Ligand binder design. Structure first.
Ligand SMILES: C=CC(=O)Nc1ccc(-c2c(C#Cc3cnc4c(c3)ncn4C)c3c(N)ncnc3n2C)cc1
Length: 276
């Protein structure tokens, strides 16, 4: 069974009272797991008695030892990674004496895709906004890259926006496979790397500046690889500057090597932002 019976649950400092945690509506679908909107009370170790909205990862109906043992090993990662502004971090947990819950940061705004699809020509997204979004994610992607973690599905749907409009990257820890966000090598060799990630970021960028748009919109998946193998690259987005279109293409460089470094992107993006 699930409620720890014979497993080894060690006692942490992260653990939170199951009392104040109250589980509510689920959030989206499950490509990471069964996430639920939960309302914890006093989790900031600075605002007690002050209730807070959080997100939690309960287990599924058809769960298994693996389906558990995986979650704990994930919970362990989300502690190793550390804390960054542009990523969803471990907020707390409810391990011992009952079912395993994992508490992360909640985002009041939805996924970028649907956020960007609702702020396009009442909060009209100034290009100036568009470039901050990209910078944020990139610097988070850089952080994530530091501790050597790969992004499963780096898409706008797998990226979130707080009430503070700070872009948070989810996915660093199933369903269909996002082929259009995957690079030639990764779509052929089926092993991911940072170079493949840079590509996926390039695709993310296109997805941002197009304001929640469909990659390769029309190309059948069966021939996509062949087109990329030839050189097919997505055409410039509207209202996008050439320099930003170039950077995307640079991310989409055939040979993994000559593709831009995460740092290389972060620097370039900051310099662009200073000139807005
Ligand atoms: C595949 C379709 C679909 O609906 N996906 C999806 C994606 C995110 C959410 C979601 C949140 C989440 C999460 C999460 C899970 N595990 C992670 C992680 C982030 N960072 C690292 N680990 C290991 C989420 C949240 N934390 N707070 C508020 N809203 C959230 N949503 C909507 C849902 C569905």
């Amino acid at each position: 069974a699930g409620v720890s019976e014979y497993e080894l649950p060690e006692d942490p400092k992260w653990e939170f009272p199951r009392d104040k945690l109250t589980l509510g509506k689920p959030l989206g679908e499950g490509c990471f797991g069964q996430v639920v909107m939960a309302e914890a009370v006093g989790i900031d170790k600075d605002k007690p008695k002050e209730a807070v909205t959080v997100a939690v990862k309960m287990l599924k109906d058809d769960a298994t030892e693996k389906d558990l043992s995986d979650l704990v090993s994930e919970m362990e990662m989300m502690k190793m990674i550390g804390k960054h502004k542009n990523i969803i971090n471990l907020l707390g947990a409810c391990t011992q004496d009952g079912p395993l819950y994992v508490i992360f940061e909640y985002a009041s705004k939805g996924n970028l895709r649907e956020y960007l699809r609702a702020r396009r020509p009442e909060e009209q997204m100034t290009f100036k906004d568009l470039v901050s979004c990209t910078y944020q994610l990139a610097r988070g992607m850089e952080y994530l890259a530091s501790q050597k973690c790969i992004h499963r599905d780096l898409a706008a749907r797998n990226v979130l926006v707080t009430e503070n409009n700070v872009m948070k990257i989810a996915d660093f820890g199933n369903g269909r496979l996002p082929v259009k966000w995957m690079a030639p090598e990764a779509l052929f060799d089926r092993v991911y790397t940072h170079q493949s990630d840079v590509w996926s970021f390039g695709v993310l960028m296109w997805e941002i500046f197009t304001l929640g748009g469909s990659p390769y919109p029309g190309i059948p998946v069966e021939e996509l690889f062949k087109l990329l193998k030839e050189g097919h690259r997505m055409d410039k987005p509207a209202n996008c500057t050439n320099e930003l279109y170039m950077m995307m293409r640079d991310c989409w460089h055939a040979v993994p090597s000559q593709r831009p470094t995460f740092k290389q992107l972060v620097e370039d993006l900051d310099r662009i932002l200073t000139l807005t």
